[PDB]
Design an enzyme around this catalytic site. Sequence first.
Site, PDB file in Angstrom:
ATOM      1  N   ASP A 102       0.827  -1.206   0.000  1.00 36.65           N
ATOM      2  CA  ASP A 102       0.000   0.000   0.000  1.00 36.65           C
ATOM      3  C   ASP A 102       0.860   1.254   0.000  1.00 36.65           C
ATOM      4  N   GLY A 103       1.999   1.213   0.701  1.00 37.27           N
ATOM      5  CA  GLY A 103       2.936   2.324   0.643  1.00 37.27           C
ATOM      6  C   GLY A 103       3.356   2.638  -0.780  1.00 37.27           C
ATOM      7  N   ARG A 148      -6.520  19.420  23.718  1.00 39.63           N
ATOM      8  CA  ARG A 148      -5.166  19.360  24.245  1.00 39.63           C
ATOM      9  C   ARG A 148      -4.762  17.901  24.383  1.00 39.63           C
ATOM     10  N   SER A 202     -11.502   5.080   2.888  1.00 41.33           N
ATOM     11  CA  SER A 202     -10.559   3.981   2.722  1.00 41.33           C
ATOM     12  C   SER A 202      -9.376   4.093   3.674  1.00 41.33           C
ATOM     13  N   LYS A 233      -8.048   3.544  12.176  1.00 44.88           N
ATOM     14  CA  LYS A 233      -8.456   2.342  12.897  1.00 44.88           C
ATOM     15  C   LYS A 233      -7.684   2.188  14.203  1.00 44.88           C
ATOM     16  N   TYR A 249      -4.422   4.259   9.824  1.00 42.68           N
ATOM     17  CA  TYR A 249      -4.172   4.963  11.069  1.00 42.68           C
ATOM     18  C   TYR A 249      -5.436   5.163  11.887  1.00 42.68           C
ATOM     19  N   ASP A 281      -2.045  14.676  22.104  1.00 41.62           N
ATOM     20  CA  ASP A 281      -0.929  14.414  21.201  1.00 41.62           C
ATOM     21  C   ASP A 281      -1.212  14.838  19.764  1.00 41.62           C
ATOM     22  N   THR A 283      -9.371   2.081   7.657  1.00 39.13           N
ATOM     23  CA  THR A 283      -8.738   0.823   8.009  1.00 39.13           C
ATOM     24  C   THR A 283      -7.262   0.996   8.317  1.00 39.13           C
ATOM     25  N   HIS A 287       1.647   9.829   5.364  1.00 37.64           N
ATOM     26  CA  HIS A 287       2.933   9.483   5.935  1.00 37.64           C
ATOM     27  C   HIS A 287       4.046  10.376   5.446  1.00 37.64           C
TER      28      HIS A 287
HETATM   29  C1  LIG Z   1       3.886  19.165  31.911  1.00 38.72           C
HETATM   30  N1  LIG Z   1       3.231  18.067  32.649  1.00 38.72           N
HETATM   31  C2  LIG Z   1       3.061  18.386  34.093  1.00 38.72           C
HETATM   32  C3  LIG Z   1       2.146  17.474  34.754  1.00 38.72           C
HETATM   33  C4  LIG Z   1       1.377  16.748  35.287  1.00 38.72           C
HETATM   34  C5  LIG Z   1       0.437  15.888  35.911  1.00 38.72           C
HETATM   35  N2  LIG Z   1       0.767  14.822  36.632  1.00 38.72           N
HETATM   36  C6  LIG Z   1      -0.352  14.267  37.056  1.00 38.72           C
HETATM   37  C7  LIG Z   1      -0.618  13.147  37.834  1.00 38.72           C
HETATM   38  N3  LIG Z   1       0.353  12.378  38.327  1.00 38.72           N
HETATM   39  N4  LIG Z   1      -1.893  12.850  38.084  1.00 38.72           N
HETATM   40  C8  LIG Z   1      -2.852  13.602  37.573  1.00 38.72           C
HETATM   41  N5  LIG Z   1      -2.646  14.680  36.852  1.00 38.72           N
HETATM   42  C9  LIG Z   1      -1.400  15.034  36.564  1.00 38.72           C
HETATM   43  N6  LIG Z   1      -0.887  16.026  35.848  1.00 38.72           N
HETATM   44  C10 LIG Z   1      -1.613  17.175  35.133  1.00 38.72           C
HETATM   45  O1  LIG Z   1      -1.562  17.289  33.653  1.00 38.72           O
HETATM   46  C11 LIG Z   1      -1.741  18.707  33.320  1.00 38.72           C
HETATM   47  C12 LIG Z   1      -0.291  19.140  33.214  1.00 38.72           C
HETATM   48  N7  LIG Z   1       0.391  18.606  31.991  1.00 38.72           N
HETATM   49  C13 LIG Z   1      -0.167  18.490  30.767  1.00 38.72           C
HETATM   50  O2  LIG Z   1      -1.201  19.095  30.473  1.00 38.72           O
HETATM   51  N8  LIG Z   1       0.648  17.983  29.831  1.00 38.72           N
HETATM   52  C14 LIG Z   1       0.350  17.761  28.529  1.00 38.72           C
HETATM   53  C15 LIG Z   1       1.331  17.231  27.708  1.00 38.72           C
HETATM   54  C16 LIG Z   1       1.068  16.943  26.377  1.00 38.72           C
HETATM   55  C17 LIG Z   1      -0.219  17.079  25.872  1.00 38.72           C
HETATM   56  C18 LIG Z   1      -1.231  17.534  26.706  1.00 38.72           C
HETATM   57  C19 LIG Z   1      -0.954  17.841  28.026  1.00 38.72           C
HETATM   58  C20 LIG Z   1      -2.198  19.345  34.642  1.00 38.72           C
HETATM   59  O3  LIG Z   1      -3.606  19.245  34.918  1.00 38.72           O
HETATM   60  C21 LIG Z   1      -1.301  18.586  35.618  1.00 38.72           C
HETATM   61  O4  LIG Z   1      -1.834  18.712  36.940  1.00 38.72           O
HETATM   62  C22 LIG Z   1       3.842  16.779  32.209  1.00 38.72           C
HETATM   63  C23 LIG Z   1       2.953  15.532  32.175  1.00 38.72           C
HETATM   64  O5  LIG Z   1       2.097  15.617  31.034  1.00 38.72           O
HETATM   65  C24 LIG Z   1       1.418  14.302  30.999  1.00 38.72           C
HETATM   66  N9  LIG Z   1       1.180  14.236  29.595  1.00 38.72           N
HETATM   67  C25 LIG Z   1       1.991  14.160  28.540  1.00 38.72           C
HETATM   68  N10 LIG Z   1       1.222  13.991  27.456  1.00 38.72           N
HETATM   69  C26 LIG Z   1      -0.053  13.918  27.843  1.00 38.72           C
HETATM   70  C27 LIG Z   1      -1.278  13.752  27.214  1.00 38.72           C
HETATM   71  N11 LIG Z   1      -1.352  13.620  25.893  1.00 38.72           N
HETATM   72  N12 LIG Z   1      -2.400  13.724  27.956  1.00 38.72           N
HETATM   73  C28 LIG Z   1      -2.356  13.854  29.273  1.00 38.72           C
HETATM   74  N13 LIG Z   1      -1.207  14.013  29.900  1.00 38.72           N
HETATM   75  C29 LIG Z   1      -0.061  14.048  29.207  1.00 38.72           C
HETATM   76  C30 LIG Z   1       2.515  13.440  31.639  1.00 38.72           C
HETATM   77  O6  LIG Z   1       2.144  12.742  32.823  1.00 38.72           O
HETATM   78  C31 LIG Z   1       3.727  14.341  31.623  1.00 38.72           C
HETATM   79  O7  LIG Z   1       4.576  13.861  32.667  1.00 38.72           O
HETATM   80  C1  LIG Z   2       3.690   3.710   5.312  1.00 36.41           C
HETATM   81  N1  LIG Z   2       2.226   3.525   5.335  1.00 36.41           N
HETATM   82  C2  LIG Z   2       1.732   2.805   4.130  1.00 36.41           C
HETATM   83  C3  LIG Z   2       0.368   2.337   4.286  1.00 36.41           C
HETATM   84  C4  LIG Z   2      -0.735   1.930   4.426  1.00 36.41           C
HETATM   85  C5  LIG Z   2      -2.049   1.427   4.611  1.00 36.41           C
HETATM   86  N2  LIG Z   2      -3.147   2.028   4.165  1.00 36.41           N
HETATM   87  C6  LIG Z   2      -4.178   1.283   4.513  1.00 36.41           C
HETATM   88  C7  LIG Z   2      -5.548   1.413   4.322  1.00 36.41           C
HETATM   89  N3  LIG Z   2      -6.079   2.448   3.672  1.00 36.41           N
HETATM   90  N4  LIG Z   2      -6.339   0.460   4.814  1.00 36.41           N
HETATM   91  C8  LIG Z   2      -5.809  -0.552   5.479  1.00 36.41           C
HETATM   92  N5  LIG Z   2      -4.520  -0.726   5.663  1.00 36.41           N
HETATM   93  C9  LIG Z   2      -3.674   0.186   5.200  1.00 36.41           C
HETATM   94  N6  LIG Z   2      -2.354   0.303   5.258  1.00 36.41           N
HETATM   95  C10 LIG Z   2      -1.326  -0.663   5.865  1.00 36.41           C
HETATM   96  O1  LIG Z   2      -0.506  -0.250   7.032  1.00 36.41           O
HETATM   97  C11 LIG Z   2       0.742  -1.021   6.982  1.00 36.41           C
HETATM   98  C12 LIG Z   2       1.632  -0.038   6.247  1.00 36.41           C
HETATM   99  N7  LIG Z   2       2.018   1.143   7.087  1.00 36.41           N
HETATM  100  C13 LIG Z   2       2.324   1.106   8.401  1.00 36.41           C
HETATM  101  O2  LIG Z   2       2.605   0.045   8.966  1.00 36.41           O
HETATM  102  N8  LIG Z   2       2.638   2.296   8.932  1.00 36.41           N
HETATM  103  C14 LIG Z   2       2.983   2.546  10.217  1.00 36.41           C
HETATM  104  C15 LIG Z   2       3.280   3.850  10.580  1.00 36.41           C
HETATM  105  C16 LIG Z   2       3.596   4.171  11.892  1.00 36.41           C
HETATM  106  C17 LIG Z   2       3.514   3.206  12.889  1.00 36.41           C
HETATM  107  C18 LIG Z   2       3.141   1.913  12.551  1.00 36.41           C
HETATM  108  C19 LIG Z   2       2.849   1.596  11.236  1.00 36.41           C
HETATM  109  C20 LIG Z   2       0.468  -2.101   5.922  1.00 36.41           C
HETATM  110  O3  LIG Z   2      -0.220  -3.269   6.398  1.00 36.41           O
HETATM  111  C21 LIG Z   2      -0.311  -1.271   4.903  1.00 36.41           C
HETATM  112  O4  LIG Z   2      -1.024  -2.151   4.029  1.00 36.41           O
HETATM  113  C22 LIG Z   2       1.600   4.805   5.780  1.00 36.41           C
HETATM  114  C23 LIG Z   2       0.307   4.731   6.597  1.00 36.41           C
HETATM  115  O5  LIG Z   2       0.634   4.326   7.928  1.00 36.41           O
HETATM  116  C24 LIG Z   2      -0.643   4.457   8.665  1.00 36.41           C
HETATM  117  N9  LIG Z   2      -0.102   4.707   9.961  1.00 36.41           N
HETATM  118  C25 LIG Z   2       0.617   5.709  10.467  1.00 36.41           C
HETATM  119  N10 LIG Z   2       0.741   5.487  11.783  1.00 36.41           N
HETATM  120  C26 LIG Z   2       0.066   4.380  12.095  1.00 36.41           C
HETATM  121  C27 LIG Z   2      -0.181   3.656  13.253  1.00 36.41           C
HETATM  122  N11 LIG Z   2       0.322   4.047  14.420  1.00 36.41           N
HETATM  123  N12 LIG Z   2      -0.939   2.547  13.186  1.00 36.41           N
HETATM  124  C28 LIG Z   2      -1.452   2.133  12.036  1.00 36.41           C
HETATM  125  N13 LIG Z   2      -1.236   2.800  10.920  1.00 36.41           N
HETATM  126  C29 LIG Z   2      -0.487   3.911  10.933  1.00 36.41           C
HETATM  127  C30 LIG Z   2      -1.277   5.599   7.860  1.00 36.41           C
HETATM  128  O6  LIG Z   2      -2.536   5.311   7.261  1.00 36.41           O
HETATM  129  C31 LIG Z   2      -0.131   6.125   7.029  1.00 36.41           C
HETATM  130  O7  LIG Z   2      -0.733   6.755   5.897  1.00 36.41           O
END
Ligand SMILES: CN(CC#Cc1nc2c(N)ncnc2n1[C@@H]1O[C@H](CNC(=O)Nc2ccccc2)[C@@H](O)[C@H]1O)C[C@H]1O[C@@H](n2cnc3c(N)ncnc32)[C@H](O)[C@@H]1O
Ligand SMILES: CN(CC#Cc1nc2c(N)ncnc2n1[C@@H]1O[C@H](CNC(=O)Nc2ccccc2)[C@@H](O)[C@H]1O)C[C@H]1O[C@@H](n2cnc3c(N)ncnc32)[C@H](O)[C@@H]1O
Lengths: 259, 259, 259, 259
Positions: free
Chosen positions: A45-46, A144, A154, A161, A159, A146, A157, A219
């Site tokens: 597919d890539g 807020r 299509s 998924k 990412y 990642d 199925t 990708h």
């Molecule tokens: C910079 N931080 C400091 C911390 C902490 C923290 N500890 C805890 C804990 N023990 N128990 C409960 N809540 C907590 N907090 C709370 O989190 C918010 C603060 N921080 C974030 O908002 N960060 C963030 C990061 C990326 C994307 C979105 C949000 C407040 O309310 C704090 O009180 C770092 C911590 O970020 C966590 N982190 C990373 N990615 C995350 C994500 N996708 N989703 C949720 N958390 C994520 C992780 O644990 C890292 O160590």
């Molecule tokens: C480099 N790829 C090419 C593609 C595609 C693809 N299309 C489809 C589709 N329409 N329907 C069903 N399956 C599909 N495939 C299948 O995927 C595997 C191929 N590729 C990956 O293994 N890549 C990957 C990337 C990061 C982490 C782990 C895996 C084969 O089996 C292909 O047949 C790119 C595609 O990677 C997807 N991707 C990104 N992050 C992902 C993640 N965390 N989990 C699952 N998918 C992720 C995304 O759609 C990006 O466009």
Amino acid sequence: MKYMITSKGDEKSDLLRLNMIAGFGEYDMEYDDVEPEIVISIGGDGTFLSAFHQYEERLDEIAFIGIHTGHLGFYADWRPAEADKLVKLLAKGEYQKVSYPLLKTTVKYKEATYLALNESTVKSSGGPFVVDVVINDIHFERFRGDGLCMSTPSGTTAYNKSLGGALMHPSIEAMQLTEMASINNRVYRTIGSPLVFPKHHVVSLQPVNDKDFQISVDHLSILHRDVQEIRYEVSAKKIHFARFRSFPFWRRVHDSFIE
Amino acid sequence: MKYMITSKGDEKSDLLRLNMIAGFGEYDMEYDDVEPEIVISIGGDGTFLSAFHQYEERLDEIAFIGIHTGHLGFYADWRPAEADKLVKLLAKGEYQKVSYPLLKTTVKYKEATYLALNESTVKSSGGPFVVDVVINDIHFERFRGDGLCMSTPSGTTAYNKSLGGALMHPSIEAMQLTEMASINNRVYRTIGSPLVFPKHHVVSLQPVNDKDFQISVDHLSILHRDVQEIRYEVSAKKIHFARFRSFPFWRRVHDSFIE
Amino acid sequence: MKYMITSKGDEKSDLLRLNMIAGFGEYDMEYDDVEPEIVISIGGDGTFLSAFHQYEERLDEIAFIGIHTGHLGFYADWRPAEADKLVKLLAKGEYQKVSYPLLKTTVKYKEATYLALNESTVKSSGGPFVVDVVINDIHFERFRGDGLCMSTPSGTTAYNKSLGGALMHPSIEAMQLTEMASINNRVYRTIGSPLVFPKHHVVSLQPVNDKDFQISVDHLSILHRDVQEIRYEVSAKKIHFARFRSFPFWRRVHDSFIE
Amino acid sequence: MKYMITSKGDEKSDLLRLNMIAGFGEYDMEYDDVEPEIVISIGGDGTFLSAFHQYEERLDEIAFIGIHTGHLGFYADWRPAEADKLVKLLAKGEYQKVSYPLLKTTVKYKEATYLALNESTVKSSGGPFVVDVVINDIHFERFRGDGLCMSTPSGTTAYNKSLGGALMHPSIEAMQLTEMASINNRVYRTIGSPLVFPKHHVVSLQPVNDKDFQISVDHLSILHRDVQEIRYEVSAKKIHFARFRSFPFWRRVHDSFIE
Ligand SMILES: CN(CC#Cc1nc2c(N)ncnc2n1[C@@H]1O[C@H](CNC(=O)Nc2ccccc2)[C@@H](O)[C@H]1O)C[C@H]1O[C@@H](n2cnc3c(N)ncnc32)[C@H](O)[C@@H]1O
Ligand SMILES: CN(CC#Cc1nc2c(N)ncnc2n1[C@@H]1O[C@H](CNC(=O)Nc2ccccc2)[C@@H](O)[C@H]1O)C[C@H]1O[C@@H](n2cnc3c(N)ncnc32)[C@H](O)[C@@H]1O
Ligand SMILES: CN(CC#Cc1nc2c(N)ncnc2n1[C@@H]1O[C@H](CNC(=O)Nc2ccccc2)[C@@H](O)[C@H]1O)C[C@H]1O[C@@H](n2cnc3c(N)ncnc32)[C@H](O)[C@@H]1O
Ligand SMILES: CN(CC#Cc1nc2c(N)ncnc2n1[C@@H]1O[C@H](CNC(=O)Nc2ccccc2)[C@@H](O)[C@H]1O)C[C@H]1O[C@@H](n2cnc3c(N)ncnc32)[C@H](O)[C@@H]1O
């Protein structure tokens, strides 16, 4: 009719490519890799994704075919063994076209647009990812986490998924938004569920503080600087597939995930 | 024009009902609860569901309106305070109709059909729930779990949502299947993801050993005995809503789950 | 007794810091930011994390306290208004210590170790993330996805929680592994569920092809080059908290997510 | 030493049972199914569950062994082929005991207690399931959904797992609460995540309006009427397993779900 063929570039796929061109020579199919009417992709597919992007400004004029020399893909749904048959029917024509919908991503700073066959994702560069999400000019949530994934039918199925998105049958003209690891508390509250948008809905993302993001289209990952808006909508363009037999999508889903 | 009004039956809603009828009397709107053209529901989405089912054989001929006297529902998207305005516009006409798609469930043993506005669920009666799942006559998986939920677009904010289903905008003609607690091992393998089907796809469930099931249509729960097939498809019928102003669905989603 | 105080560095927190030091002067608490026995953090959990890492080689000898001048954190569970009371009890002593478990991450190439209070995450640098996962020298799965998060008990309300991890009460000596977006097909198969490991279990990650990874320890993100192993185990060291009253963890959980 | 053996009761398992008893006769192991010291279960984990419940008042005095004549279970981790070896070592003794923790469920109306090896679940009888959840006398959430599952460590690979619970290594003395399809809105708000409780924490459920519930202990399902409290805690009793070789739990997890 004009045609071209792309290869994963390992040994198995380069060979199969030369044997197809020879068979095409035994009809009079003109190889042209500049204005083909038929684009054959060989590998995974890539490889197919790359074939699509290599020709994304002539979509309305090309039928793509996938041959998987590794494991079945969703776009590469032909085994090598069926190659000679393919060439044959590919010559006589009298084949049918199926079109799958595509995703337009628009990135305003000038303004750049991308076409995705799988999905367009957004993450942050360095800092935490915080955008406000706007649906047809309606402020919906402040996300807020990642990041976010906007998937085609299509692409669901793919990412989508893995992000807990729903699997969608490709005839449905829509786009699906999946969250990536949202934080949720009384302060920050997002919807959670995958959201599924129809044609003509514009989903627009707006940054709060940091303005740099990593945008991924099938990708390919561009870093974008000083971003003002990301806009997702279902594209007007469609990709066309050459269909020689029934391989229903749900059948395709079954073989890839169940048995 | 002919009209009728249903009540949750608590004090707040019965009062609001009598005041609306009086206001309708100040125009000449004939109350008829046998052949209304306009069906007003007062209370909650549950009340509205009951209004829909009370009149599900005249759907092509009725506009429904929801007034929430509790908290906003998705179908009951009018506050009581707006009642007098409602009556007014409701009299002059010149209002627009929006139609949401519906779900047909067919249960073969004779054969009985149900129309759902939220969803049709299936569980087992006593024993474990094991059905084979068939999509357009294609065996897809053998599901072993607590059950399955088939949700309409507007139902995806309901049960479907709690099952991890995707939220779907109602203009999309489709149906969504969510699992309920599938067991997954090398032996038993299901897809996991919500699946989203278009018009004309028939999703059919087929029992393996136990033949008794509990089928739920919009929270009505029938026990069915000696079951041979359950068939889901997007219905040809649609429900019609009277629309007096913009209350976009995604706006509606925002108010119910984010803020 | 020796003490030091750290600030988020906005206006509200710097002020509260100076007023606490003055109150400490009204007892004879020697400020020492080199060998404190009591470390007070003022701002948010982030500020607290920094306080912990600023002193992570004297853990067995420090009691930490959090004051949240923003919103409650899990480590910063004191409102500013309670500051004068804090100083008071903090002087007389006769307070109790609670210890929460910590996470050791070991990264072999020499060999570097990190101590996490929230979690240690691993992602890929550029390419896809593919590691084999080894549990007490037992090959368990080959993970292909966005990454992995190893969370402490008190970290399970943090990142872990957003990854669908379970929330764990901090007295339990363990570590929790959450997936980040694994791909799952007949080819690639991971467990899915959060896994929860006891003391003395070593979870070891081993790269397949790309050897570069981004490792995050409490939001510090190091890029590591030419990696041979990442090893997670529950640390022998523990963090100590000064406890002046009952604020049960589950109570703390309730206030942050429910009401 | 006294012993007894239980059978799934299909042909394969009854035969294997008689051949084991004969081999036991070739030592002098007294068969006693009233006060055995060793309880052998033959068939599947279900058979084993029944063996455990058949003898749950002598737990402190029995070593259980599972032989799977179907597919491997988590408790039935012996293939039939290894039976003769089993009998042998089983006679000489010099084997080791491993104990897994258990779950006590207490149901107040008198008062009845149950011991679970997998989990204790609660659902509603007819109406919607609404309970307030209380943790060590602390009101935590008001749950409105399909139900709740309290799983043992070794039960986390069972129902718990399908509910998105975390998988827990059995040496950890704890209990895990998983939701079943909670509704979540500004009105109704639950934690979502699996919660994992230590020894001595009492999780208590309290009904709001309907007082009838269906309680399930290891797939036994009792209907309970006029319920006042359900109380979960980690039991003081433990189950003992006869261990003749290394079959690590995570190894066991790998074989059942990955490969
Ligand atoms: C910079 N931080 C400091 C911390 C902490 C923290 N500890 C805890 C804990 N023990 N128990 C409960 N809540 C907590 N907090 C709370 O989190 C918010 C603060 N921080 C974030 O908002 N960060 C963030 C990061 C990326 C994307 C979105 C949000 C407040 O309310 C704090 O009180 C770092 C911590 O970020 C966590 N982190 C990373 N990615 C995350 C994500 N996708 N989703 C949720 N958390 C994520 C992780 O644990 C890292 O160590
Ligand atoms: C480099 N790829 C090419 C593609 C595609 C693809 N299309 C489809 C589709 N329409 N329907 C069903 N399956 C599909 N495939 C299948 O995927 C595997 C191929 N590729 C990956 O293994 N890549 C990957 C990337 C990061 C982490 C782990 C895996 C084969 O089996 C292909 O047949 C790119 C595609 O990677 C997807 N991707 C990104 N992050 C992902 C993640 N965390 N989990 C699952 N998918 C992720 C995304 O759609 C990006 O466009
Ligand atoms: C008796 N209902 C009436 C309805 C509806 C309803 N429609 C929708 C909709 N289109 N979009 C958004 N919200 C909706 N609502 C909202 O739901 C709450 C009302 N009802 C429930 O509280 N019912 C319930 C049932 C079992 C356990 C817990 C709650 C209000 O806020 C309404 O406005 C029936 C509907 O109950 C749904 N249902 C069943 N089991 C559910 C579960 N476990 N979780 C979530 N929903 C579940 C399902 O759709 C059924 O048809
Ligand atoms: C009748 N069982 C016996 C048992 C057990 C059992 N123990 C464990 C365990 N410690 N660890 C890992 N695997 C286990 N097994 C495995 O489970 C399959 C056997 N049983 C089911 O197939 N039952 C079922 C019930 C309803 C719907 C679908 C399946 C075999 O492979 C066994 O080896 C009872 C157990 O059923 C679990 N259960 C209930 N509802 C479930 C659901 N929706 N999904 C998954 N499990 C569910 C629960 O734990 C109950 O106690």
